[PDB]
Amino acid sequence: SGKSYPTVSADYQKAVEKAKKKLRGFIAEKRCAPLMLRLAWHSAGTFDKGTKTGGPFGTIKHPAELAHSANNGLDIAVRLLEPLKAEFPILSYADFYQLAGVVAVEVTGGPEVPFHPGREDKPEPPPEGRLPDATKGSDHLRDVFGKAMGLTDQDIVALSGGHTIGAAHKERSGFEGPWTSNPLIFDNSYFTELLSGEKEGLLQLPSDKALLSDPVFRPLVDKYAADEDAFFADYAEAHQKLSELGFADA
Ligand code: HEM
Ligand SMILES: [C-]#N
Ligand SMILES: [K+]
Numbered sequence: 729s730g731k732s733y734p735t736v737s738a739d740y741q742k743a744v745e746k747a748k749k750k751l752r753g754f755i756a757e758k759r760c761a762p763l764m765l766r767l768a769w770h771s772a773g774t775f776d777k778g779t780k781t782g783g784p785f786g787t788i789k790h791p792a793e794l795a796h797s798a799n800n801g802l803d804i805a806v807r808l809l810e811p812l813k814a815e816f817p818i819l820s821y822a823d824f825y826q827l828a829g830v831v832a833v834e835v836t837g838g839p840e841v842p843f844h845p846g847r848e849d850k851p852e853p854p855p856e857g858r859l860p861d862a863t864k865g866s867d868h869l870r871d872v873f874g875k876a877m878g879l880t881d882q883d884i885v886a887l888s889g890g891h892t893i894g895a896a897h898k899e900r901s902g903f904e905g906p907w908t909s910n911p912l913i914f915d916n917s918y919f920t921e922l923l924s925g926e927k928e929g930l931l932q933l934p935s936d937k938a939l940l941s942d943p944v945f946r947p948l949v950d951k952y953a954a955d956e957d958a959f960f961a962d963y964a965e966a967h968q969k970l971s972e973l974g975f976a977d978a
Contacts, residue, residue: 762894768829782854
């Protein structure tokens, strides 16, 4: 999908392979796979198709970006990774955060998302306001994923399935609790819970519920609730696409 992968040195590639292993162990032990996937989404997602500036280029590490109200918790995620990152000084932060997202999906039992190295760390972040609003609906999803990032309606629904792991926190976003009964297991339960209604102890954001009422998003929700393999396929496709917005002269 219009992507040309940069050449990196044999030493860079070796660090990638070694960092991936250390990330597995670290992330599994710390139980922070959801936060790492969220960090990856944010580090990819401050991308714009209308300006082509900022986003998946080591920019999330800057304290100017960790300030935002959609960024509560992203500071924690960056901090958790600092010591590991210091073991692999050759790797760009951009690649490191995307590798962490790929690993987060993998060690929670999700699909193996292909990873290619070579994202450069850019010197200035994008503007605050591009990123997601849980209180909004389908027009908003299409604005953040479609218009800004060039992703398709299928990507939108698949990627929303990221919420199958993790939870909201009253002190971060203000929302609270896991979307699923197994929030460290990457499966299609996000979609099953979304369809089944609101359960005691389980979260649905207005942005999740937007998927149910949209003529295009809904049949996809039905498909993924019915077929985890179809979910895994489309999820891996969309995660790779998202992770690579930071590549290839866009
Ligand atoms: C569709 C637009 C989206 C909106 C409005 C949204 C909103 C939110 C909110 C409000 C939280 C809770 C933050 C907190 O209180 O800790 C959250 C958490 C999370 N998000 Fe999203 N999100 C979106 C898309 C995505 C995507 C595309 C992914 C990855 C594929 C993702 C992955 C996650 C994960 C894994 C968590 C759990 C974080 C944790 O457990 O600490 N989200 N999201
Ligand atoms: C979701 N952030
Ligand atoms: K789950």
